[PDB]
Design a protein around this ligand. Structure first.
Ligand SMILES: CCC(=O)SCCNC(=O)CCNC(=O)[C@H](O)C(C)(C)COP(=O)(O)OP(=O)(O)OC[C@H]1O[C@@H](n2cnc3c(N)ncnc32)[C@H](O)[C@@H]1OP(=O)(O)O
Ligand SMILES: Nc1ncnc2c1ncn2[C@@H]1O[C@H](COP(=O)(O)OP(=O)(O)O)[C@@H](O)[C@H]1O
Ligand SMILES: *C(=O)CCCC[C@@H]1SC[C@@H]2NC(=O)N[C@@H]21
Ligand SMILES: [Mg+2]
Lengths: 261, 673, 247
């Protein structure tokens, strides 16, 4: 008798349930979905092939080695799928597990997906929702950001890269969307700033909250960082599919031609 | 240098600078562990690294670091050092420090507190010397009642007598009482000055000495009543009552006067029961009459210059005497073996009051240790910082030779081959002094710097031949740089065609004059024509080394190139002086005549807040002395803090800014002239 | 000018206190040949320094931080000033030498309203695209994403060195302690362990993020050697008409 069959089911149910039902309820209370149903809405039905669903962080410092702090997937859902019959690669960030903070496994999965995409020649869509880099990891998060930036620069001009900000993104993770071709935001639920309002208040002695520091209105009106703003997640994803229908898959292929009337 | 004899195994050198390094070196030669003290700033000094152990003593200022009793007490207690050596200065002449050290178990290299107390005040020292049957300063002991007392003192001892306000505190003043009416009116004026200065209104009248020469005798003693006099030294060349050039054997004295002075000093030391190294200073008039003046109960700053001509390690002798051993030499064993000259290199600008303090961090530092007969004593290494809390002295240069002329030539050569980049020094003044006609002849006095440069130091005046050599060297160096600029590597795609220009016709602007120069190159030898005169310049033309040695018409010269710009400006150090020249081609010089001059405006007082911020602590006051670009105040901000200096020299007049104020950008902080 | 000349004046140019500042132009002058440095835009965005110099007779481009001005923080102007110079040096096969002392990015409201993200991305992309040999020296500080932005090892950097006074961390000690040790509410000692363990270049050294920790006095003597070996560097990249600079 071997307990390996039940281990697979337990890991699968842990990955599906994320980091807890209470956190899922908190996510739903703010009017924001989770990564899995975001991917399901974005891609065609029955076409998402998840990869690397059994990856966990290997840090063993500051009490991170406890089983309660060890979750499979490392708060990221990556894979490939088809939009209107055309291949695409997708990664989504899960705010449930340490607020979507990036670590070794997170960056490793993102880098592997982007490398596979540049090898095959398919676009990349990134749903961004993360609180920044993981302090507990240390220099590993900085190295992961550096690898992601290097692969973003390498693939620039080779395959299209689309970023969609769905939650509050802060710190170095802000730079990854800025290196892509297009950036979209969701009104009233997404933010972009290098530093939080507390540091600004401490340093320059000025009072400001997140809404007018990194809000969608600021970036889509008087900052020039984002390209469009949408009211909620569903409309944003439908508009994303419509926009993705325009672009070619790679620089080798010519401009798409469609049936006309 | 025998290490078999027992000696203290732990010495604490409670000093800094080059004296600490010298003591550490001597102790290392003795095979004795050394322990050094240092403030927070001097954590990376040469002496602290040379020693074995290192104990901090407190903050930057000397009043809490090198003058702190408690810090030294706990340093000794933790270290358990057997002996303590103060060096000179700081706590060398502190009787309180002396008996605090000597109380429990600590032995102190130096004289006993009784001798220091005896020679701690001028009046007691003078009366003791008079009791010691030595030639004291010609005068009388007492107080003046009226003009009658002054004229009777004048008629008592000598006609050429001052009426200077002596006694009280200091005893200074420009006064002469040569004539009877001069005695009376000078006494009136001196009484008025004393009332204004100290209020004593009484004088210890002393005879006048024209152009006095300051001689000094080195004396060594032990606890067994043995005294030796180690030749003499001359320190006539002084400014601001500070010696700059010292000359060990006195050219003004003969054997008989030297023996008389040595005997008098030995008798005085035996009377005081001195048991260490000391110095007895005499003033000698033109008539070869010497009068006693002060006695230093510590190691002299210029002791190496008398060490060179005798071969006796003074620090070794001090340590051996403090151990308890008697002297191992006799009077007849002392010989005058050669000649010696010492100069002090300070960090000061000699163009303002013969030297003003300067600050900075050294970027390049090189000593001419490869020259023959050159010794350098310095506590400075490349990257060191010349702070403000301490003496700005940089180094001591000693040259020993068979006679005066060889020593002077070696001193000049060493001064020409000594690299200091980062701060401003006074090497030009030293070189001008050691080549003056009067100094070479041997007619010097304490007023030498006063009368040789009545207006002040203006630099080294240059003759026709020297000016021609300078112009030729500058033109040759410019042409060499231009030629080196044409050497690329092979391209194999676009071949390089090097130009074949034969003659370089240049216009050279120096001071306020323009000369025409023609330069030709024939390999490693340049032929230069300046206003018809023809010269040949040869050198290896190594453009990377700081020092460049050239040969103009056979004469060997050494130069330095401090600055070089594409616009033509060049700063060249030649014969110890920095000259600024402007070299251009003929076409460029002709075209430059149409360039309009740009007139300046406004005032130099531009200092203000670079950005709005708060002042943590202001440390200035209207009228405070300002050094050469010293840090005038500090304004802090996020993370880093800013420290803005006073680069432009000017007396403080009004400080509009105050500590803690949130002054914005452009606000007038400190007004400077 | 020999390529193995020692520069002892750099042994103590960095103050021990983490609050005082120093001049990086002095270090640049000490390292380069004949202490000649042609500076580009010397009065604009003074918190960054860019210029041309020569090492062992070979033309090199130098970019570095200036802790004197605004603590060396990056802003909008300095980002583009460094980025265009780096791109030009890349375009004509000129090696790059970088001196890193940065505490992060300058915070404020005008910086965010002006789009500091785009210009930071410009500088990051400029270092990431570079295919010429590049050498980096970390003198005192490297914090957050600014450490990656300044050509870290992971952006295809060749050789990286850190002086013994350097230190690499995600944030400051106080911020990390506050964001980690919140429930413990005891910063009396935890800060001490944090500053005695992670406030040094050892976490980056053990993970291979820096080639070696070198003595400052040998700095020049190392860089020249590297420029001798990397002179024949060749890499291959995927084909494209032209990438998308974030301008
Ligand atoms: C490379 C440069 C970097 O390292 S930047 C890293 C970010 N620097 C910071 O100081 C953290 C600031 N971020 C935040 O405060 C929040 O995450 C923001 C962005 C405001 C999100 O708003 P909010 O919805 O109120 O957060 P929350 O209350 O739901 O907290 C959820 C949990 O997420 C966690 N989290 C977030 N970021 C990190 C991180 N970098 N490292 C470790 N943990 C992180 C938080 O600990 C938080 O935990 P908890 O559930 O509140 O107990
Ligand atoms: N009797 C004197 N007559 C004229 N000038 C004197 C006389 N004594 C001293 N001066 C001057 O006083 C100055 C300082 O005297 P000194 O006893 O050496 O004090 P210090 O120990 O500070 O050097 C000397 O430069 C000396 O030239
Ligand atoms: C100092 O102890 C760290 C707290 C203040 C951070 C300052 S201000 C904003 C800059 N960004 C950063 O990471 N450090 C700098
Ligand atoms: Mg004296």
């Amino acid at each position: 008798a071997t307990s390996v069959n039940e281990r697979i089911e337990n890991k699968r149910r842990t990955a599906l349930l994320g980091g807890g039902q209470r956190r899922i309820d908190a996510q739903h209370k703010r009017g924001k979905l989770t990564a899995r149903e975001r991917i399901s809405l974005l891609l065609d039905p029955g076409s998402f092939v998840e990869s690397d669903m059994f990856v966990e962080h290997r840090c063993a410092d500051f009490g991170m080695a406890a089983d309660k702090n060890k979750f499979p997937g490392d708060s990221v859902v990556t894979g490939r799928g088809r939009i209107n019959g055309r291949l695409v690669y997708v990664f989504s960030q899960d705010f449930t597990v340490f607020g979507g903070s990036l670590s070794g496994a997170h960056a490793q999965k993102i880098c592997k997906i982007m490398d596979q995409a540049i090898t095959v020649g398919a676009p990349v869509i990134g749903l961004n929702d993360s609180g920044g880099a993981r302090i507990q990891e240390g220099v590993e998060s900085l190295a992961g950001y550096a690898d992601i930036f290097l692969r973003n620069v390498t693939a620039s001009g080779v395959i299209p890269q689309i970023s969609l900000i769905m939650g509050p993104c802060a710190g170095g993770a802000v730079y990854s969307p800025a290196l892509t071709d297009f950036t979209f935001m969701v009104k009233d639920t997404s933010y972009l700033f290098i530093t939080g309002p507390d540091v600004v208040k401490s340093v320059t002695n000025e009072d400001v909250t997140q809404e007018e520091l990194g809000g969608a209105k600021t970036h889509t009106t008087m900052s020039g960082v984002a390209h469009r703003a949408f009211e909620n997640d569903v409309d944003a994803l439908c508009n994303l599919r419509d926009f993705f229908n325009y672009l070619p898959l790679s620089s080798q292929d010519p401009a798409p031609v469609r049936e006309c009337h | 240098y025998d290490p078999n004899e027992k000696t203290f195994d732990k010495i604490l050198v409670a000093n800094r600078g080059e004296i600490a390094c010298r003591v550490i070196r001597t102790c290392k030669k003795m095979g004795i562990k050394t322990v050094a003290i240092h403030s927070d700033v001097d954590a990376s000094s040469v002496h602290v690294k040379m020693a074995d152990e290192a104990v901090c003593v407190g903050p930057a200022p000397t009043s809490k670091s090198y003058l702190n009793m408690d810090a030294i007490m706990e340093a000794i207690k933790k270290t358990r050092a057997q002996a303590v050596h103060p060096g000179y200065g700081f706590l060398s002449e502190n009787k309180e420090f002396a008996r605090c050290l000597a109380a429990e178990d600590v032995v102190f290299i130096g004289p006993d507190t009784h001798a220091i107390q005896a020679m701690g005040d001028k009046i007691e020292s003078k009366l003791l010397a008079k009791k010691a049957e030595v030639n004291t300063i010609p005068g009388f002991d007492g107080v003046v009642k009226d003009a009658e007392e002054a004229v009777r003192i004048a008629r008592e001892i000598g006609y050429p007598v001052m009426i200077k306000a002596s006694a009280g505190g200091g005893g200074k003043g420009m006064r002469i009482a040569w004539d009877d009416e001069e005695t009376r009116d000078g006494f009136r004026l001196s009484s008025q000055e004393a009332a204004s200065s100290f209020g004593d209104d009484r004088l210890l009248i002393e005879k006048f000495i024209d152009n006095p020469r300051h001689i000094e005798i080195q004396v060594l003693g032990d606890k067994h009543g043995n005294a030796l006099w180690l030749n003499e030294r001359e320190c006539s060349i002084q400014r601001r009552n500070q010696k700059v050039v010292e000359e060990a054997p006195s050219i003004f004295l003969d054997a008989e006067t030297r023996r008389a002075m040595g005997e008098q000093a030995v008798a005085l030391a035996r009377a005081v029961k001195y048991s260490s190294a000391g110095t007895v200073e005499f003033l000698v008039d033109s008539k070869k009459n010497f009068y006693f003046l002060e006695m230093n109960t510590r190691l002299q700053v210029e002791h190496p210059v008398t060490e060179c001509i005798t071969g006796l390690d003074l620090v070794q002798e001090m340590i051996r005497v403090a151990k308890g051993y008697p002297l191992r030499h006799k009077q007849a064993d002392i010989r005058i073996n050669g000649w010696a000259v010492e100069c002090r290199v300070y960090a000061e600008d000699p163009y303002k009051s013969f030297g003003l303090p300067s600050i900075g961090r050294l970027s390049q530092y090189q000593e001419p240790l490869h020259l023959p007969g050159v010794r350098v004593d310095s506590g400075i290494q490349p990257g060191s910082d010349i702070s403000i809390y301490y003496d700005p002295m940089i180094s001591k240069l000693i040259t020993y030779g068979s006679d005066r002329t060889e020593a002077l030539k070696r001193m000049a050569d060493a001064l020409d081959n000594y690299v200091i980049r980062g701060v401003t020094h006074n090497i030009a003044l030293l070189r001008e002094v050691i080549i003056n006609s009067r100094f070479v002849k041997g007619d010097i006095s304490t007023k030498f710097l006063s009368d040789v440069y009545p207006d002040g130091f203006k630099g080294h005046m240059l003759t026709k031949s020297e000016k021609n050599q300078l112009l030729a060297i500058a033109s040759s160096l410019f042409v060499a740089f231009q030629l080196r600029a044409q050497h690329f590597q092979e391209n194999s795609r676009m071949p390089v065609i090097k130009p074949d220009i034969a003659n370089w016709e240049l216009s050279v602007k120096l001071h306020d004059k323009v000369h025409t120069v023609v330069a030709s190159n024939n390999g490693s030898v340049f032929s230069v024509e300046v206003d018809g005169s023809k010269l040949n310049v040869t050198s290896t033309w190594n453009l990377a080394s700081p020092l460049l040695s050239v040969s103009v018409d056979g004469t060997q010269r050494t130069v330095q190139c401090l600055s070089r710009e594409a616009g033509g400006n060049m700063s060249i150090q030649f014969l110890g002086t920095v000259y600024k020249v402007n070299i251009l081609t003929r076409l460029a010089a002709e075209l430059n005549k149409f360039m309009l001059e740009k007139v300046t405006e406004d005032t130099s007082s531009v200092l203000r807040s670079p950005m709005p911020g708060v002042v943590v602590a202001v440390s200035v006051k209207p009228g405070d002395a300002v050094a050469e670009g010293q840090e005038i105040c500090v304004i802090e901000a996020m993370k880093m803090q800013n420290s803005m200096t006073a680069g432009k020299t000017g007396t403080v007049k009004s400080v509009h800014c105050q500590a803690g104020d949130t002054v914005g950008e452009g606000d007038l902080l400190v007004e400077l002239e | 000018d020999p390529s193995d000349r020692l520069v002892p004046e750099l042994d103590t140019i960095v103050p021990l206190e983490s609050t005082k500042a120093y001049n990086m132009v002095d270090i640049i002058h000490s390292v380069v040949d004949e202490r000649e440095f042609f500076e580009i835009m010397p009065n604009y965005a003074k918190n960054i320094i860019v210029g041309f110099a020569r090492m062992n007779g070979r033309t090199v481009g130098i970019v570095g931080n200036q802790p004197k001005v605004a603590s060396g923080c990056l802003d909008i102007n300095s980002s583009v000033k460094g980025a265009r110079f780096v791109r030009f040096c890349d375009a004509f096969n000129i090696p790059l030498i970088t001196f890193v002392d940065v505490p992060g990015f300058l915070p404020g409201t005008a910086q965010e309203y002006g789009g500091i993200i785009r210009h930071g991305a410009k500088l990051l992309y400029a270092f990431a695209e570079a295919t010429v040999p590049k050498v980096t020296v970390i003198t005192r500080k490297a914090y957050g994403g600014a450490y990656d932005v300044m050509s870290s090892k992971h952006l295809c950097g060749d050789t990286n060195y850190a002086w013994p006074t350097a230190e690499i961390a995600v944030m400051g000690a106080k911020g990390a302690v506050e964001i980690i040790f919140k429930g413990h509410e005891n910063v009396e000692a935890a800060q001490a362990e944090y500053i005695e363990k992670f406030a040094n270049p050892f976490p980056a050294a053990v993970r291979g993020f820096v080639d070696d920790i070198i003595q400052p006095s040998s700095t020049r003597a190392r860089i020249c050697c590297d420029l001798d070996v990397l002179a024949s560097k060749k890499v291959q990249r995927p084909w494209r008409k032209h990438a998308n600079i974030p301008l």
